[PDB]
Symmetry: C3
Subunit: 323 residues, 3 copies
């Protein structure tokens, strides 16, 4: 008998409490958030006893939500089209018959010939950009990169509610930019993020990450209850490492890529500087949903709540009557 009142309390609390209130059933929701992100990196570093600025270590440069900060390099200066022996011992050859299709991809095409790379070692010859890259001793990382700064201009708009807000508040001043200390909880509206800070929030050691290269995710969440104040609509920052496979795998431990700088002589012959770049890639991911009171969903939601509590009390009353 009392279980009838108990079931009534559970129905009323669930349908009118969690379902109607906690789940904001009274609210119209906009999930088609419109986001824009623009980035700018600042910092200088010493690498190969040369100073490196944003135009040196940032790529691509257009300042999108995805960019790489180069922290390590294998530089192959003055490559030229020609024939030369493969550098790595993986291409060791003693007989020209060993230089065949079974060989792994290399700096160029295989001539089928076999050549001496050094007095001690002989490898397969290739036609391509010469000389081949040599990966015998590890290259240093750009320590100063830990202090580089990332400037994130993130604009978001829920169009259903014609609501626009950004991580740059309208009262932001040059002094703020010069002195604000970003923190996900303490100061979400500071547009400057310290690269090292981003790496640590992601749970990574800058030394190792900068050695291997990696992909870090900067997630920006705009979950805003437009019923509450405009100043309650604030961005929630999360940080992680997206290439999680890399740490668990010995075959491929990080992130790197190769690109070249192309030059011509007055003579007119082409030569290039090859670059194997290790760096930290930053993906700025923006998500959000907004909700605002609307009478229509309040009517439909409350009507559904009353029909639900009624059907519940009816069925429990029947089940109690028969049993």
């Amino acid at each position: 008998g009392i279980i009838n009142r108990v079931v009534q309390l559970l129905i009323i609390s669930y349908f009118v409490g969690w379902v109607f209130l906690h789940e904001k059933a009274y609210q119209v929701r906009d999930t088609a958030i419109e986001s824009s992100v623009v980035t700018k990196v600042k910092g200088s570093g010493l690498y190969a006893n040369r100073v490196m600025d944003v135009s040196d270590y940032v790529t691509p440069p257009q300042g999108t939500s995805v960019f790489v900060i180069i922290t390590k390099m294998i530089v192959t200066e003055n490559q030229m089209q020609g024939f030369c022996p493969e550098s790595e011992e993986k291409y060791r050859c003693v007989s020209d018959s060993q230089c065949g299709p079974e060989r792994l991809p290399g700096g160029g095409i295989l001539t089928g010939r076999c050549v001496n790379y050094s007095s001690v070692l002989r490898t397969c010859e290739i036609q391509g950009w010469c000389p081949t890259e040599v990966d015998t001793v590890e290259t240093p990382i750009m320590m100063e990169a830990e202090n580089f700064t990332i400037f994130i201009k993130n604009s978001i708009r829920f169009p259903l509610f014609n609501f626009e807000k950004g991580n740059l508040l309208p009262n932001l001043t040059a002094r703020d930019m010069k002195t604000c200390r970003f923190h996900p909880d303490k100061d979400p509206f500071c547009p400057i993020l310290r690269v090292g800070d981003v790496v640590k929030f992601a749970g990574q050691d800058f030394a190792k990450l900068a050695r291997t290269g990696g992909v870090l995710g900067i997630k920006i969440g705009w979950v805003c209850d437009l019923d509450k104040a405009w100043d309650q609509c604030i961005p929630k920052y999360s940080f992680t490492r997206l290439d999680s496979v890399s740490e668990k795998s010995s075959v491929s431990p990080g992130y790197n890529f190769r690109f070249a700088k192309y030059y011509k002589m007055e003579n007119g012959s082409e030569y290039r500087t090859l670059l194997k770049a290790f760096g930290i890639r930053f993906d700025v991911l923006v998500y959000g949903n907004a909700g605002k009171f609307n009478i229509i969903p309040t009517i439909i939601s409350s009507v559904a709540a009353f029909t639900s509590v009624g059907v519940g009390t009816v069925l429990c009353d029947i089940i109690l009557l028969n049993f």
Copy 2:
């Protein structure tokens, strides 16, 4: 008593009208739209008394759904690694003690020394790419850019219905491409969009936007009722400015980025031309959903409609009987 018939009419109209008909409950919906976009920009401009073509002002060049049209530049010719004073007055120095870590990021690293940039002004010395960039007088914009054209090839497919359509209709001819006048309502299938037109549809003044740089969004919506004709499935174009924070903020008003062109002398020393690029970034955003009649959702939906009207009439009859 009559309110029983009124409630019956509201239930029947809501569940069989808005819910079943207006909401196309009889329809199976595909929301996993598959989209592809390829872009090509055409136009020539005069800047620094030099002609600039797509390979000069478009970046990146691969013709993706996101690209920048450079409209303004600060060009720093023939930079070389070395030591030089900072150009901007923000780095004004009178004592070498002022050249410290508190200084903002600059062209290079700080030597701690203090040097005379000019007879009137003295600033901090830096090691890096020299000379530093000078932002004393504003640079002009590339007016002709207002007439550049954007070619958008957008292919979409709802795989559930094996439906494929594109903004390029199969009867498109070279004359069409040469003469069609794009309009979101009047001619949605003209693949050529005038940059200036795109800027205005976005509610922006090309002169100001091209001065500050900005991000414009070209949204393409494919909402198609595959029950209706194939020719009713047409793209709906919307235009906006995504970096809305920029206009409301004095600290950062637009969009720009820095990249370099790298050169070598026969002597072998590196020198580069630095470029601070202001431009309009175009993000082509494609969305869509499709619906087609399917008997299953018609059965389940109609059954749910009858159970709903029945439960409604039952509950209203009970509430009327007791009260």
Copy 3:
């Protein structure tokens, strides 16, 4: 009378079978899959009797989920700023009055003058990068590209369940990478995909696609029932051509873009090599959802199932009683 039992069986089977079991209503679902992709292309080709490696034919180089493998080129060596006649016959001129605004976009700006490109043909003069590109005879494709390899490191994580898996299994070894043969069904965890294989899975002929250029989609789906074994969570590969409009359209049949290599003389004058690149663009699209048993959805789902079967039997009993 028997139709009452029939309706009871259909209600019980639908609500407790398809709705509760087949639809895994007992399961909590994570649809906010977190994905990261890194790519690396390997292979060498012969083009213009020059060897081409990843730094030559891959763009952009940063190894993102979207990259192009250049398979065809129109190379315009040593362009210089100046005046020259337009190359293509589309710009044929006999009178300087024909060189006007009605002309289509060209290599540069129009001087309004008319010049002889050859003894047989006269075209409009332009100021810009000279000479203009000549598209009279088709250029070959890089056949070897069919054998290039794409290395895909895809990391995925359902955070709700703190579940992380990747196409690189933790027991992956160098021998595996050297010898595994990718197949969507037979070996989903081989990280090396043969470009030609990808083209064929997409239903395309490499010769034609490489002639015209195109966009191929590599879709990776992680639909995992975390109730089952970890080793049951495997990636499902799908392949397609995203620029489907291209094959149905004569005006634009493929995908190409133009970029330049910029050079300076010791004299200091600029000259560039223009490149019209035809290639295959690969878009790696990752999707997924995960589900794991949770008691809460089991309680709510089973309660809803009993209320549903009860309401069904009640309404069918009433409809049978009255009729």
